[PDB]
Amino acid sequence: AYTTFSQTKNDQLKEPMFFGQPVNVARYDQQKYDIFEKLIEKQLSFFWRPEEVDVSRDRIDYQALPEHEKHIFISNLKYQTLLDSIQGRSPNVALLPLISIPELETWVETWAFSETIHSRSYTHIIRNIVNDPSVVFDDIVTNEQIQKRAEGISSYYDELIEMTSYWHLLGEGTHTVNGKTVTVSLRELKKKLYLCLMSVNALEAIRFYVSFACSFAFAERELMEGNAKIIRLIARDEALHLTGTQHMLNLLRSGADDPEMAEIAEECKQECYDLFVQAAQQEKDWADYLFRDGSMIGLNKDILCQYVEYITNIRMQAVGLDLPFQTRSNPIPWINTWLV
Amino acid sequence: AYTTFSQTKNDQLKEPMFFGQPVNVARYDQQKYDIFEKLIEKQLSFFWRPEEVDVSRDRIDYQALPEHEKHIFISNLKYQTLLDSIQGRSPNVALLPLISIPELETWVETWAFSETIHSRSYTHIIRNIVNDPSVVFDDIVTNEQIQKRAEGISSYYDELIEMTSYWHLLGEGTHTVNGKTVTVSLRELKKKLYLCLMSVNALEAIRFYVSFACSFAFAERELMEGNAKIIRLIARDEALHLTGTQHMLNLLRSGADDPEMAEIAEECKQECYDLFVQAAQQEKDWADYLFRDGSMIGLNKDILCQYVEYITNIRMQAVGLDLPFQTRSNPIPWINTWLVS
Ligand SMILES: [Fe+2]
Ligand SMILES: [Fe+2]
Ligand SMILES: [Fe+2]
Ligand SMILES: [Fe+2]
Ligand SMILES: [Hg+2]
Ligand SMILES: [Hg+2]
Ligand SMILES: [Hg+2]
Ligand SMILES: [Hg+2]
Ligand SMILES: [Hg+2]
Ligand SMILES: [Hg+2]
Ligand SMILES: [Hg+2]
Ligand SMILES: [Hg+2]
Ligand SMILES: [Hg+2]
Ligand SMILES: [Hg+2]
């Protein structure tokens, strides 16, 4: 029931962001939500190319690094690779088939495309600092710690994807597939979408920012300044990404779009809360793998942990959720220097 | 069966382009087929901003045009808008779930992204030549002439997406769904992918080139020069897209990547030929209508029909199909000034 070009002449200003008639014409002259058009413009305005960035000296710096420092740096980079590897394909595979307004459709495509540039930049960094990158890259999929810190991301997406397919193939209802009952409830798919988005908002808003803190730790010590310039560029982009997911989330909950979506946001509020808690906890646990051969004189599981509670509280509130952690001031405001 | 992050450690250098294990790590330090990385790099180097082109004088030119000419121009722009609407989303929805090598996955995403910049450029143009763009945009979907000329593009994509869903959900086999039998065959899914790629190759190969001729016809005459500059940037990107689809089809039929696929392509050859020919035909039928209420200055149904035969022959040969028409030299060599590729 999905079509790459729906044949009904529909007023795109009146479709819901999701689950409406699939987008036919891509026009940008009017928007139901101008915020998406604005993000597209900003993101295109920020277009940059990694290879332009000079990381020549980062090879020296890295080589000079104490092994536990190299381990920290690399582990962090491998996590970044994982997250942008997923974020490069996921929004397109999971969201495009559900979007019903053109401005959001293109935003998603621009957002996803920008994640591939991030992925390209890690390849640029890695090949410029190691001897065989296959070592770093081959250690992502099987790094239990990595998969432990990243656990659950591929899950929201894949389930959202599976249900959307059944919904497109069979339509709403209960069906019999190979002698088994399969229920396709649209309310339920909306709930899986709502949850995937919140999960992605956490990924964009917290998982990356935590990784930035490590990256910048080195920069403040005047090491790996190429990587840092890249990270700043990447960070500038993820900021747009999170602005987009917060908006989607907030608009859905305001009930101004699909009203059933606002009742759903309501029903699943504890689930939303729980996943962020779970995410924030996974990042803390990472601290214990990062600091295995030891920490640095500017970063340890403690500061890490505090920054994490710090940022999580900021994000959860941005999306109207209750704060799980004790309020505090930025445990590392120098980071705000690079952050911008 | 589709996963956004396959947990199996796999050698990405030995997966087939399609139908293997879904890509997990996005790395560009190595590739099975470097054409895809090369394509990504050139496309990134070609990045351009529509709004950066002055289209301010196109308004009076368009206003000054004769009605048969406004019609030809606008109709052509509507068709471009349609093709890029489809190509901005389809390669992503249709191919991403089936790609098993990273360079190809990222190319497809980069390719589709570039098509959205083309779409944004049409809004830039349209907003600058008409008082109310809705008049144009609200007529593409149901315009008889446009659905006719575009006929079948979406269907190839939609059927492939549908079978892919069934394949990922139920796996290969004969199954039941609501009292009816639903057979799922990888070989058939492989054939639908080949035909859909053949179809997109024709879209990139000929459907856009016919449209370029029309727009550049106005630029030769020094009219709608803002639109021309945009179309020229668009044509440069399309040339890369076409290189991509050609390499994908040639790698597929050759047997080097997927032997079964090679067998399948040989068996649907006539089918591939017919669809290519049917696309050429539609472009001709378009030009027939287009020029019936009056023909533009420098281009007419006839020269246009010859150009279609001329590119069609070149494009068909490039992916191993028999030439369907009479061998001739280019009928509008002036087009080359505009096609920088
Ligand atoms: Fe990213
Ligand atoms: Fe992002
Ligand atoms: Fe295009
Ligand atoms: Fe294209
Ligand atoms: Hg999601
Ligand atoms: Hg998700
Ligand atoms: Hg660090
Ligand atoms: Hg950190
Ligand atoms: Hg929720
Ligand atoms: Hg919520
Ligand atoms: Hg297709
Ligand atoms: Hg296709
Ligand atoms: Hg023309
Ligand atoms: Hg074929």
UniProtKB/Swiss-Prot annotation, chain B:
Any GO BP: ribonucleoside diphosphate metabolic process
Catalytic activity entry: a 2'-deoxyribonucleoside 5'-diphosphate + [thioredoxin]-disulfide + H2O = a ribonucleoside 5'-diphosphate + [thioredoxin]-dithiol
Pfam families, per the entry: Ribonuc_red_sm
Enzyme type, top EC level: oxidoreductase
Coiled-coil region list: none
Cofactor note: Binds 2 iron ions per subunit.
EC number: 1.17.4.1
Task performed by this protein: Provides the precursors necessary for DNA synthesis. Catalyzes the biosynthesis of deoxyribonucleotides from the corresponding ribonucleotides. R2 contains the tyrosyl radical required for catalysis.
Quaternary structure (record): Tetramer of two alpha (R1) and two beta (R2) subunits. The B1 protein is a dimer of alpha subunits. A radical transfer pathway occurs between Tyr-122 of R2 and R1.
Further details from the record: E.coli produces two separate class I enzymes. This one is the functional enzyme during growth. A substrate-binding catalytic site, located on R1, is formed only in the presence of the second subunit R2.
Family of this protein: Belongs to the ribonucleoside diphosphate reductase small chain family.
Name of the protein this chain belongs to: Ribonucleoside-diphosphate reductase 1 subunit beta
